[model samples]
Target chain A: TKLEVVAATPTSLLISWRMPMFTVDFYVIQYGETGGNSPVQVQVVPGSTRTATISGLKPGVDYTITVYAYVQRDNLHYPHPISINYRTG
Target chain B: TKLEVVAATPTSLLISWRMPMFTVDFYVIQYGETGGNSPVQVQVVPGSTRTATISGLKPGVDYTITVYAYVQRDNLHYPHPISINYRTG
Candidate 1:
């Protein structure tokens, strides 16, 4: 899967990614400060939602974003998730 | 009425104002770049809401904010509104 940054601001980011081949159950976004202790996870979009905007981020900070696709047909999840790094504007 | 700036960031600002004495219909926020050609208007809060956070502003820019309280008691409104000026960090 390929992750792309559509638009961004100092405290918000709009990101889009390609959907997986299998039927997706849901999409989860896990992001936090790069090399931080713990990452925060949130349900960004539903099964068919391709884009989401994350907000409430601090300015001038580096963040690590990971996207996971969960398939509920056979209780399978992402094997190789899509990950990217970005810095707040 | 008194308008206060609660918090601010590089691109966002949180402001709070006192509710007018009259029965208000709604609150409208008008803001734009300082000395710009046109301003934008948005309904920030309802009649009872007192605080609002405005976003999607440019960093390191000056902006003029005007808040209006619309009162509908016998179909009358305020003759004077609250206005302020702020510069984004």
Candidate 2:
């Protein structure tokens, strides 16, 4: 997941991307402040989805958006995540 | 704080209720296993609606369903969500 930033604003960021064709139980799309004890927001997308739009961001703040998938052997929280750093404008 | 379990099956449960007279922000209908490590399912309905059908339940299991509401002073999870327990057979 070389996560894509389809768009970003003061309060919303639209992300879209595809992972290598591997089967998974679900994908985790989470975001948090880069250097603070900020609330981490998480969204669980079905293994079949590739687009997620994250909202309710504080205006003009830094964020770390991470993407990873869990395989349900039924085990999970995954590894080697692709994280992108961005700040709201 | 009593609600009705209209129907129940191996995979779904239909619930129905009406408040006497409370101004609510919205309604919360949630369920979980009696004492098992099952995930809690939640459904939020607008203040204008009633009756929510909960699906995807494990067959022949015990579950507790609860419902409550909030006022628009914009509060949250109150000390009262009417809970009902039933066993699926």
Alpha-carbon RMSD, each predicted model: 15.9, 16.4
Residues A1-89 of candidate 1: C-alpha lDDT, one tens digit per residue = 66788546677888888855667766766576786343232433687887888876666878877676655464344622557787886
Clashing pairs in 1: none
Best by lDDT: 2
Q: What TM-score, over all chains together, does every model reach?
A: 0.45, 0.46
Worst 10 residues of 1 chain A by lDDT: A36-45
Model 2 achieves a DockQ score of 0.03
CAPRI grade, predicted model 2 = incorrect
| Candidate 2 residue B40 C-alpha distance from true site, Å | 21
List each candidate's DockQ score. 0.01, 0.03
**Location of the lowest summed lDDT over 10 successive residues in candidate 1 chain B:** B71-80
Name the candidate that leads on TM-score. 2
TM-score of structure candidate 2: 0.46
Fnat, 2 decimals, each candidate: 0.00, 0.00
